[PDB]
Amino acid sequence: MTMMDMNFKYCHKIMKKHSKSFSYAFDLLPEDQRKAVWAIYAVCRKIDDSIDIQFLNQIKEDIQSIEKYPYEYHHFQSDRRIMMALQHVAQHKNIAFQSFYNLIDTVYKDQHFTMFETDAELFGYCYGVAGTVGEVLTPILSDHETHQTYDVARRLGESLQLINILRDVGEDFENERIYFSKQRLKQYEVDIAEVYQNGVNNHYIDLWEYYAAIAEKDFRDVMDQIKVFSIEAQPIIELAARIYIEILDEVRQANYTLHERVFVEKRKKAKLFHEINSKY
């Protein structure tokens, strides 16, 4: 195990600790591509957590060091192991650094969190925080990147974020956050705090299912265009997607509770993989 291998293994650990789903799916990639993914993930994770600001500027500065001096040795201010891995990746693939900066800008913003007036700002947030992740991963998951590849990855990520939001309504409220748009909360006649006190009702379902139908529709457009990705990645991406979709059912299964996080059992993930793995 070379030093660089240790670095990637740190990145691996960060990823299976914090997101079982993507980990389960992406680890199935060929050695070289999964390592790149581990590394992009860990950099993203670390951006997400820089909250609990000084450390976020340090991450941004490290990323810029790499962008403009890929082959020079840096003394990273943030996480050496993560940045060493990221720099190794960038030496071999065309990383969209602007997407990292988009992601970071979006995270700065969260500490001024103001509810979204309209779905459009909700969608722009889904871009900044997840669509950007899709863009960064594109060169890993396809041989010849075209605007179409980026577009599909962008849409997949935004759709996954949306599911994430659909799943964490409860937890998110507690942390003083709501991602449903004022526009759409007025329209559907819905007060989060109220439902978080008195359980669900027909108006909440409707609002929730309204957003769910959106995620689900982006999902299919993505599956329809799965072909933009490399052959080895298509089944993995689809598996990753199908798992996050299945979380939609889980939430209905638990009658949309806002007091517990639902999840897809590892065993069910393998079932989906088989379903998918069968015809590939």
Taking contact as CB under 6 A, which single stretch among the options 2-10, 157-165, 209-217, 247-255 is the one that binds ligand 3RX? 157-165
250 binds ligand 3RX per the rule CB under 6 A: no
89 binds ligand 3RX per the rule CB under 6 A: no
CA angle 187, 118, 201 (to 5 degrees): 35
Residue type, 248: L
b (16+ CB within 10 A) / e for 197-212? eeeeeeebbebbeebb
Integer Cα distance of 221 and 219 in angstroms: 6
Integer Cα distance of 166 and 212 in angstroms: 7
CA angle 246, 251, 266 (to 5 degrees): 45
Chain breaks in the chain (C to N over 2.5 A) after: 52
**Segment 44-63, which members bind ligand 3RX (CB under 6 A)?**
48
Residue among 7, 8, 12, 22 that touches ligand 3RX (CB under 6 A) = 22
164 binds ligand 3RX per the rule CB under 6 A: yes
Integer Cα distance of 98 and 243 in angstroms: 29
134 binds ligand 3RX per the rule CB under 6 A: yes
**Segment 105-124, which members bind ligand 3RX (CB under 6 A)?**
107, 110
Q: Is 41 annotated as a binding-site member?
A: yes
Q: Is 74 annotated as a binding-site member?
A: no
Residue among 43, 63, 86, 130 that touches ligand 3RX (CB under 6 A) = 130
Residue among 95, 133, 212, 264 that touches ligand 3RX (CB under 6 A) = 133
Binding mask 207-236 for ligand 3RX (x = CB under 6 A): ------------------------------
Integer Cα distance of 83 and 76 in angstroms: 7
Element spanning 117, H or E: none
39 binds ligand 3RX per the rule CB under 6 A: no
Residue type, 173: F
| CB nearer to ligand 3RX: pick between 7 and 161 | 161
Integer Cα distance of 172 and 128 in angstroms: 18
Size of the site for ligand 3RX (CB under 6 A): 15
Give the residue ranges of the annotated binding site for (2E,6E)-farnesyl diphosphate.
18-21, 41, 45, 161, 167, 244
Residue numbers at the binding site for ligand 3RX (CB under 6 A): 22, 48, 107, 110, 129-130, 133-134, 137, 153, 156-157, 160-161, 164
